[PDB]
Every structure is written in structure tokens, then in C-alpha cells.
């Protein structure tokens, strides 16, 4: 099968910056090649047929070179609703195969998260369970560290974290970390604390909530 | 011009048989083009399956010869797809596709808007949906956030809204996290502070494997 390459796995731009990405063919592929689009959450578009002809709807920004082996796309004048996963499909030989995929990820200036903890609802508590939740909205860059304290004691397990893709409007990423307790453990403690450590502060941001108030 | 529409169960047992039909309008299959069916698994990583041709003619993806299936129906302008003997590895978004059959005149691919399947031996469950309100002692600020907690549900997917959707800025949903064979994922909406409770605001959750819908409003804890 023909192996088709993608470079680079990922990065970053600035808007309004000129982007370009790599596919390579292990054999010439006489520019049956197609470039696909990806945006976060949402389905597969073609956006470029023969190497370098354009889908009608997509914008003249976008545009396809290369041959043989070696094949390119370029943006330019990259725009907020660009960034997602592209792929290159070779229709050339069966079986059809596609590269690996380039993900776009549009850089910006940094931005502190804004942390809000949800205590467990009435509801939830009927049931045995108990989850604390901590919104960790916002943010800029992704990485970021979350940590839970118990009456003041760090709590490891029992803690799932997941963060969004970079949002489409503000390039902002946001996570959430929920810990989940029994009723039985929830109600042996006073104190539930989540703390965010993100490289816009040197201290964390602390959000609290006590269960005698 | 065209349009594709992938369907069929988004829940298969391991072993058995996976199908899914493509329903096309606004182009005959039997005129031109060829039929496909592709897939990408979680990871993002993408596989041509196969096509049946607008002549009936087929062309399987070597790695699946043995377990693989793509027929039509003319009268129904409809092609199909059967995975046989299924793992969890089969778990993918199924996507429905045309392609050019000939080299000239020169045809774009164009892909249907995606199906997911999962496959296991777990059982459908609805989620409960839980409130996520701010502790009375917490703080009014300018904007409040609050949010839904999605909680025990199989298979993925979900879709959570705000106020039916009309809520849409200031709204995100977290990626679900999977445990012990059931999801858990939260929906945040962030709006002004002079807006709730007086202006009330309730998450939409719909679980389509389950035909669930379930509406909570948000009620401060006092």
C-alpha cells in the first residue's frame, strides 16, 4: 500500500499568517491527491481535488501545489475558523490511503483560567454518589496543572480531567476536573478546594467551598 | 446536486455484523461515480474501506477482504455497507462517499457527515443529569458560570444545549471520560449575573442511543 506522510504532526500560527503543510507519497501519485479539512468536533471536507483544484465554496486562501511524491498546502491569511486537522488522501492505486493528519492550532497572548467549583447536587446525593467539579475556563497556553485538596490533604485518585479543543472564537482552551466521591467519604470531610497552576501566575488560583456553609 | 446520509445502530456486539446504509438524492448511483466507505478511529486516524462502483463492480481495502460487503440498491438510490465479525477495534466514525470512477473528467471526492459505531458488549444506559450551581456562600460577580453534569451513560454520543439552543456564546461541553463501561462528561455556560435567577437557565441533554432527552434547570442553592 502506498504509505502517505504528513509533516508536521502539529503547530502553531498567528492569525493572518501564512501556513503550509507537508504530505509525502512512498511512490509517485501522479497528483491524485486530495486535502481534507477537520475543524474541532465536526466532519470531514474535502477542500482540494487534483493536487491543486480548489472545491468550489472553500476560500481563495487556500491553495494546493506539488507533484510526484511531494505535495503542499497553503493558507494564507490563516483565519480563527481554519484550525482543526488536515489530512491528505491519495486516490490514486487502491487501496486509497490517507496520511496520518497536521493539526492547526492557532497561537495567541496568554491568558489566565477563570476557576469556578461546583459542590454535588441534592440530586446526586440521593443516589450514594457525590462528584465535585472544578471549570477551569479560558485559558491560554493549554498546558496547565489542576489539584484537589480534601481538608486540606492533595488528593491523587478518584480525579478525571478533560480539556476542550481550542475554541473557534477566541482561541482559548478550557478544562474540567471532576473528583468523585462516595456520600459516605464526601461527608467525612468539611473542606473541598481545587487549585490551578497555569504559567500566567506563580500562585495558584483557589477556588473553595466548605460543607458547614 | 448530491447529497449523502450515512445511518444504522451506533451500538454493535463484538462478533457480529456491522451495517450501515448511505442514502443518496440529487444523483443517481447507477449514472457515474464510484460509492465509498471510509472510517476514522478514535486517535483520528483514517481507513478507505472500499466502494461499489456506479456499474456494481466493488473494490475492497486488501486489509479487510475477508469481512467486508458494499451492495446497493437501484430502485432505493441507497448503497451499503456490512463489517462482519466485529472487535472493539472496529469502534470508528463511518463516513459515505462519492469518488470519480474515471480519470477524466476530473471529480472531487465528497464525504457524507459521518456516523459513529461503537463496538461492545456493554449495555445502553441514559445518562443522569445533575445541576451544577455555584455554593450559596460562593460570589456574585459579573458573570456567573454554571453547568450540567452528564453522568453514566453508553455509548457515546451525547449533545448538551442551553436554553434550547439559545444560549450559545459563553457555552462549552468537556470531551466525555470513560469509566468502568459508562461516560461522564460536563456542559459550562457562562452569562451575566443580572441574568440568574432571574432569568431562568436549564441544560438540554440528548442521548440518541437510549432515545433520551432529559431538560434540568439550574436552581440556586440556597
Known amino acids: 500500500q502506498i504509505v502517505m506522510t504528513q509533516s508536521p504532526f502539529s503547530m502553531y500560527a498567528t492569525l493572518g499568517e501564512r501556513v503550509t503543510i507537508t504530505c509525502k507519497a512512498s511512490?509517485?501519485?501522479?497528483?491524485?491527491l486530495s486535502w481534507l479539512q477537520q475543524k474541532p468536533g465536526k466532519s470531514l471536507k474535502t477542500l482540494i481535488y487534483?493536487?491543486?483544484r480548489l472545491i468550489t465554496g472553500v476560500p481563495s486562501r487556500f491553495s494546493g501545489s506539488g507533484s510526484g511524491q511531494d505535495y503542499s498546502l497553503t493558507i494564507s491569511s490563516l483565519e480563527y475558523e481554519d484550525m482543526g486537522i488536515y489530512y491528505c488522501?491519495?486516490?490514486?492505486?487502491?487501496?486509497?490511503?490517507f496520511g496520518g493528519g497536521t493539526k492547526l492550532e492557532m497561537k495567541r497572548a496568554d491568558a489566565a483560567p477563570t476557576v469556578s467549583i461546583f459542590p454535588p447536587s441534592s440530586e446526586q446525593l440521593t443516589s450514594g454518589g457525590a462528584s465535585v467539579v472544578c471549570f477551569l475556563n479560558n485559558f491560554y497556553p493549554k498546558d496547565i496543572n489542576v489539584k484537589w485538596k480534601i481538608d486540606g490533604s492533595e488528593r491523587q485518585n478518584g480525579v478525571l480531567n478533560s480539556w476542550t479543543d481550542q475554541d473557534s472564537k477566541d482561541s482559548t482552551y478550557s478544562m474540567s476536573s471532576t473528583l468523585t466521591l462516595t456520600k459516605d467519604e464526601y461527608e467525612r470531610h468539611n473542606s473541598y478546594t481545587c487549585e490551578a497552576t497555569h504559567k500566567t501566575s506563580t500562585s495558584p488560583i483557589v477556588k473553595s467551598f466548605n460543607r458547614n456553609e | 446536486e448530491v447529497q449523502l446520509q450515512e445511518s444504522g445502530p451506533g451500538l454493535v456486539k463484538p462478533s457480529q455484523s456491522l451495517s450501515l446504509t448511505c442514502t443518496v438524492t440529487?444523483?443517481?448511483?447507477?449514472?457515474?461515480?464510484?460509492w465509498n466507505w471510509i472510517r476514522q478511529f478514535p486517535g483520528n486516524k483514517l481507513e478507505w474501506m472500499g466502494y461499489?462502483?456506479?456499474?456494481?463492480?466493488?473494490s475492497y481495502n486488501p486489509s479487510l477482504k475477508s469481512r467486508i460487503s458494499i451492495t446497493r440498491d437501484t430502485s432505493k438510490n441507497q448503497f451499503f455497507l456490512q463489517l462482519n465479525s466485529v472487535t472493539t477495534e472496529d469502534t470508528a466514525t463511518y463516513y459515505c462517499?462519492?469518488?470519480?470512477?474515471?480519470?477524466?473528467?476530473?471529480?472531487?471526492?465528497?464525504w457524507g457527515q459521518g456516523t459513529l459505531v461503537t463496538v461492545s458488549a456493554a449495555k445502553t444506559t441514559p445518562p443522569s443529569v445533575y445541576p451544577l450551581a455555584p455554593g450559596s456562600a460562593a460570589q456574585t460577580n459579573s458573570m456567573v458560570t454554571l453547568g450540567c453534569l452528564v453522568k453514566g451513560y453508553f455509548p457515546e454520543p451525547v449533545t448538551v444545549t442551553w436554553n434550547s439552543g439559545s444560549l450559545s456564546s459563553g457555552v462549552h461541553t468537556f470531551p466525555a471520560v470513560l469509566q468502568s463501561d459508562l461516560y461522564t462528561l460536563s456542559s459550562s455556560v457562562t452569562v451575566p449575573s443580572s441574568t440568574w435567577p432571574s432569568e431562568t437557565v436549564t441544560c438540554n441533554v440528548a442521548h440518541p442511543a437510549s432515545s433520551t432527552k432529559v431538560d434540568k434547570k439550574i436552581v440556586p442553592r440556597d
Open positions: 462517499g462519492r469518488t470519480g470512477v474515471y480519470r477524466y473528467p476530473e471529480r472531487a471526492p465528497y
Open positions: 440529487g444523483y443517481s448511483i447507477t449514472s457515474d461515480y464510484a
Open positions: 461499489i462502483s456506479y456499474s456494481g463492480t466493488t
Open positions: 511512490q509517485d501519485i501522479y497528483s491524485y
Open positions: 487534483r493536487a491543486n
Open positions: 488522501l491519495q486516490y490514486d492505486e487502491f487501496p486509497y490511503t
